[PDB]
Amino acid sequence: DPEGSILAEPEELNQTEQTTYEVEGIGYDFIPTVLDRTVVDKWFKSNDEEAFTFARMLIAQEGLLCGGSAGSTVAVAVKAAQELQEGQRCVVILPDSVRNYMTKFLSDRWMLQKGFLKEEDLTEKKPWWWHLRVQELGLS
Amino acid sequence: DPEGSILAEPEELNQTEQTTYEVEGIGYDFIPTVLDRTVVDKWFKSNDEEAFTFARMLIAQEGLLCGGSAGSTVAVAVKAAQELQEGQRCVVILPDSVRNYMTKFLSDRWMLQKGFLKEEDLTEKKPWWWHLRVQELGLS
DSSP states (O other), X not given: OBTTOOOSSSGGGGOOSOOOOSXXXXXXXXXXXXXXXXXXXXXXXXXXXXXXXXXXXXXXXXOOOBOXXXXXXXXXXXXXXXXXXXXXXXXXXXXXXXXXXXXTTTSHHHHHHHTSSXXXXXXXXXXXXXXXXXXXXOOO | OBTTOOOSSSGGGGOOSOOOOSOOSSOOSSOOSSOOGGGOSOOOOBOHHHHHHHHHHXXXXXXXXXXXXXXXXXXXXXHHGGGOXXXXXXXXXXXXXXXXXXXXXXXXXXHHHHTSSXXXXXXXXXOTTTTSOGGGSOOO
């Protein structure tokens, strides 16, 4: 359940200041009639930054062209599933494709504008020549 | 006695191909009537490169604004006087001033043109930034 929504229980997990989140397709300010929370063994809260970062990591390291909700699901799974041991199996549901978020989190510009990515995080992994000026070339 | 001249004895010291030398004021193709070689204990041959280099070293490390002949004299003295020990004294005669050679060996251009100085010898002692291009500046 994204931050700002009240779907997750118990209630104290839902106490947060901001009611709006950039993640889409999940989280609501009301309990749907369809939903049956009794069959849920546990709930987790998730935020936009980790969700989009995990979606990008999924794209870059597994080829799964999935959206932000899949990123949130995987981010929560990597935490909840620490209890499992070898030989046991876990399943994650990836809702939708990246197509719906082409100019959204998939774009570095939008990520930096929202602050979900910081210049230090973007630059720490770049080559040694990244910071050099074009002045260093033999252009003419 | 500069190379190309026949003043020095014994004769085999004077066997060299080139008869012309850039050093001035010393060396001749004949034995002067005034000269008395019998009172000379030893003779040495000298060349332009070492003479001018020693003159420049004299200027740069002792303040003696002397010409090429003084450089030749000091270059020969530093060789001949190795036999002396502590407590003994040596004298060198420095003929003339640097005034007569202002655009000559005193000029790096002329030294490089004559080949008496090589770019490697000039550059080996320069700072680490010497070879960097002006392109490395923050000019605007």
